[PDB]
């Protein structure tokens, strides 16, 4: 589980968003796995607008933040899990490093803030939903 809060949004994994978050819904893409919802009180965190390829990223699994290397955002076959069929999904950079189904919401980061969250996992590898395009999330 977990969450990114700029702003007034909440950005969450399309496949984790609760009935709070589809009845105050922003924007959702299942081609992405993200949800942003409406939020009453404001965040803390802030958006990397860059493109680096290593950071730092939580691991619930582990209760640790670990050092990664990742590809740029891109179309990837994921296989079958009990939220997707196997599939594409867009906007998604892999690293090595451990990852199981409830690590999905673990924050990404990089010297200029947060790049994205955890989404896809297994075999040694971490896939990210990117949010470096979502220009919006830093306005009203
Ligand atoms: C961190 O995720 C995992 C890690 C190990 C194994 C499996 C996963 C879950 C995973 O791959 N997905 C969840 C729904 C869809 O977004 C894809
Ligand atoms: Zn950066």
Redesign the pocket.
Known sequence: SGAIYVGNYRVV???LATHNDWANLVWEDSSR?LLVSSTTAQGCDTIARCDCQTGVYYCSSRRKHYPVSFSKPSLIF??A????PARY?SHLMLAVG???????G?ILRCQHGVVGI??????G???F?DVRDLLWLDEE
Do not use: F
């Open positions: 994994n399309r496949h796995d994921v296989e899990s009990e939220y997707y999904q451990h990852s199981e189904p409830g690590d999905c673990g955890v989404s896809t996992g297994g075999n590898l971490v896939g939903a």
